[PDB]
């Protein structure tokens, strides 16, 4: 139960990257955010960071005066921005904090992830996050994917494979300011049931 989502996350991670490797076998071509498998990959990587967060890190709202008259789809809004800042160079933090259209901590987390993929740095960041275990304790319950020693070894090995692709994902879209369903369902925070 507290870890039921972990196999689901791992399958989507592996499956989406294998899909990307087979499609980008021209291999002189960049993966963009117009590619559905790249976005599925991003959703699975977001689910890694969402899984097992303490409830205090799940917001009812993302921020901004964005009208809630629509969005009759209310979704929880996980946020972990200071965890990411702790392992990031000030010049990346500064660029992320000054994005014209990204203006919520939700958006900054999701922008950070796509920027890290473009830079080829996801394994680098995870090694640091896994080295700063005390800070992880402040965001994650003991059953969380990121606090599971074995699954951490799986994830590092999976992330190493990402440098076989060249990413140019969009990390600056206003769309990043609020979550959608797929990362939340994959993480177990919302039911897989709700996907359709």
């Amino acid at each position: 139960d507290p870890q039921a989502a972990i196999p689901v996350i791992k399958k989507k991670l592996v499956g989406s990257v294998k899909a990307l490797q087979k499609q980008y076998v021209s291999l002189d071509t960049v993966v963009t955010s117009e590619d559905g498998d790249a976005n599925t990959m991003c959703s699975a990587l977001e689910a890694v960071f969402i899984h097992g967060l303490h409830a205090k890190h799940i917001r009812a709202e993302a921020g901004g005066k964005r009208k809630k008259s629509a969005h009759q789809k209310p979704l929880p809004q996980p946020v972990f921005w200071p965890l990411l800042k702790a392992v990031t160079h000030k010049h990346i933090i500064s660029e992320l904090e000054h994005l014209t259209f990204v203006n919520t901590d939700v958006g900054r987390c999701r922008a950070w992830l796509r920027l890290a993929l473009n830079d080829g740095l996801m394994e680098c960041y995870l090694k640091l996050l896994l080295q700063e275990q005390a800070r992880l304790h402040e965001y994650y319950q003991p059953t969380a994917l990121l606090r599971d020693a074995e699954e951490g070894e799986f994830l590092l090995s999976f992330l190493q494979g990402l440098t076989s692709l060249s990413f140019e994902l969009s990390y600056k879209s206003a769309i990043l300011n609020e979550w959608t369903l797929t990362p939340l369902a994959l993480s177990g925070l919302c039911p897989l049931s709700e996907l359709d």
């Binding site: 955010s33 976005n39 629509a70 979704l75 969009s170 990390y171 879209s173 769309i175 369903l181 359709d196």
Partner: protein
């Protein structure tokens, strides 16, 4: 800042002309003929007058879209939220449209119309299925609406008026 222009684009049958008629007159109608070329109406809302260019969405009119989007205050991209078969084409035409340099920076409001239909996709499902997060060069937003039963027409208008 009290006059503005919008262009409505998107695939045939998505509800663009219906949306214009509902904004201008409140008339919904179940029977419609596809728009040949373009349509236009001028509406006033408060102290804002809005000229709305309603372009045909059938394949042979889609080359018109880039031209009629040049210089406008905002672009409305209409989707039939209940027609999953058309999603691939609708997404392809959207990203193709927003690739054109002359349209750089123009705000875009994606509308998932026909929310009144059973198992219509909602705005968050459309955000994902349309790969909207690729669009990073402009203000961009996605609402679920229904021209038939008037859901979210209010805020749709309020969002567009913000760019007068």
């Amino acid at each position: 800042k009290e006059e503005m222009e919008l262009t409505l684009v998107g695939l045939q049958y998505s509800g663009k002309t219906t949306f214009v008629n509902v904004i201008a007159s409140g008339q919904f109608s179940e029977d419609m003929i596809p728009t040949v070329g373009f349509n236009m109406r001028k509406v006033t809302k408060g102290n804002v007058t809005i000229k709305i260019w309603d372009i045909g969405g059938l394949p042979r009119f889609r080359s018109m879209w880039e031209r009629y989007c040049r210089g406008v205050n905002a672009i409305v991209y209409m989707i039939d939220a209940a027609d999953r078969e058309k999603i691939e084409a609708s997404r392809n035409e959207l990203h193709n449209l927003l690739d054109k340099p002359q349209l750089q920076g123009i705000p875009v409001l994606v509308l998932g119309n026909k929310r009144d239909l059973p198992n219509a996709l909602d705005e968050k499902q459309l955000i994902e299925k349309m790969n909207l997060s690729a669009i990073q060069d402009r203000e961009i937003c996605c609402y679920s609406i229904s021209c038939k039963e008037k859901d979210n027409i209010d805020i749709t208008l309020q969002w567009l008026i913000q760019h007068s």
